[PDB]
Design a protein around this ligand. Sequence first.
Ligand SMILES: Nc1nc2c(ncn2[C@@H]2O[C@H](COP(=O)(O)OP(=O)(O)OP(=O)(O)O)[C@@H](O)[C@H]2O)c(=O)[nH]1
Length: 317
Amino acid sequence: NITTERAVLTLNGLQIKLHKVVGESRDDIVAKMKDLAMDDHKFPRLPGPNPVSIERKDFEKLKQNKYVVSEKTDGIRFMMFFTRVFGFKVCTIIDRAMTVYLLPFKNIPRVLFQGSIFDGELCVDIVEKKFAFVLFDAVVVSGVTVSQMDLASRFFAMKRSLKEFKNVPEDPAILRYKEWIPLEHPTIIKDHLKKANAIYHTDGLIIMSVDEPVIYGRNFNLFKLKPGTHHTIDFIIMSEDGTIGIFDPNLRKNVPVGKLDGYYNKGSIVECGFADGTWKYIQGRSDKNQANDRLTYEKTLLNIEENITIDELLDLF
Ligand SMILES: Nc1nc2c(ncn2[C@@H]2O[C@H](COP(=O)(O)OP(=O)(O)OP(=O)(O)O)[C@@H](O)[C@H]2O)c(=O)[nH]1
């Protein structure tokens, strides 16, 4: 049987109960996805790109090359994988740490189960108070590797397969497709962004190449933009006098970086924002035992400093 263990995900004040796939079953689903995705990376990862923050150096490239734009949905990143395990046709969603849950739909066409890997976000529909799964892109559809073709071909393949699918009320998520708008369409972009934000929780926008094949991992040509300067960092309290530190993952030692005004419990993790030269407390995190690493900190400072805004960005066009 597929050895499962139950789990509940909470997003935006709502929860979803799912069977987390465990042990050798988890191991086999992951190894199956690695083969279908033909990823020979020596480390377990999803066959999908992680965006990079937009930098002012990128503005040239944005204006030479072709790109599409969409809202950055705020929810959980999942690769959705249709396969067959021990004879049964299975729909799974895998997250970035390689944790596998079943997410079953009634009406998935049996072709998908020959090997579909679609990329998306599990998220909540504000208007409907139901979960939605929003598909960003496809890697393999019914056994056909679509990853090296251009974005419009990938969506053509994906939409083709699901063309006869209908959701039914008992399905655990509303399957929906990311509408990507061309980066030369500012008024169409703004309007799409306004409609998008009526339905979803968004964290800015994502800008993606119209024609490059799928990258797996950090994709230096997939850009995200946070609205305004609302970057935060999680620091560890290294002193009761609020000395905040940041983790160096290869020393495995926290390094002192600043100091907060107030009394703080050593070893806690505080989410802070930067304002006028110092970091300021926003909330303590009881759910974390580790600060953000140096890399995340260095890059967030650069972004704070550069202060790119969505209106600056959409006015380049
Ligand atoms: N690749 C991609 N990611 C998207 C898209 N829409 C929303 N996202 C989400 O944006 C994430 C970007 O990574 P980060 O900028 O680190 O954001 P995060 O994973 O929410 O982490 P925090 O910033 O710590 O909250 C992706 O991993 C997706 O979960 C999209 O169209 N493509």
